[PDB]
Design a protein around this nucleic acid. Structure first.
Length: 152
RNA sequence: UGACUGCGUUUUAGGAGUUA
């Protein structure tokens, strides 16, 4: 259904403890993660979330620790981090080296959402995908490529 | 039902609390 495949996607996403804040805001949030993690710094999730929230909140009041926490889980599910567990304390996390460019990181992010849609049996075309995730028709073939790699 | 806050999930995952 024309905007109800859309709300069922975000339902499936929220159910997996993840979240999409819209094309513009998601983009900044990811860039911020990269800013913190691309030089190989190692931050607990708590601190990483703080880093992003503190810069984003003043420009987007929808940006809570809770909501940004959910964006980061998207990347946790996508297996983007190198995790270092510590005894009696929280894990630190770094970006895997292959994911230290926006292009690369965003591919994985995107893929993870597609995969959630697949797990939930939601057939969605690349034209749609480019609208949902970018608000334009400029990423159809990017999204097509993601889809094809996922069914193999 | 939402929102929020912890802790957990790389052995892949949530779940508790607070609140209207």
């Amino acid at each position: 259904n024309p905007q109800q495949l859309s709300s069922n996607l975000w339902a499936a996403v929220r159910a997996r403890g993840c979240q999409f804040l819209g094309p513009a805001m998601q983009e900044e949030a990811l860039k911020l993660v990269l800013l913190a993690l691309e030089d190989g710094s190692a931050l607990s999730r708590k601190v990483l979330v703080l880093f992003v929230v503190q810069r984003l909140e003043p420009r987007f009041p929808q940006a809570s620790k809770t909501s940004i926490g959910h964006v980061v889980q998207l990347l946790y599910r996508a297996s983007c981090f190198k995790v270092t567990k510590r005894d009696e304390d929280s894990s630190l996390m770094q970006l895997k080296e292959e994911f230290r460019t926006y292009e690369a990181l965003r591919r994985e992010h995107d893929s993870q959402i597609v995969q959630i849609a697949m797990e939930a049996g939601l057939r969605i075309a690349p034209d749609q995908w480019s609208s949902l995730l970018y608000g334009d028709q400029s990423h159809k073939s990017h999204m097509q490529s993601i889809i094809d790699k996922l069914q193999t």
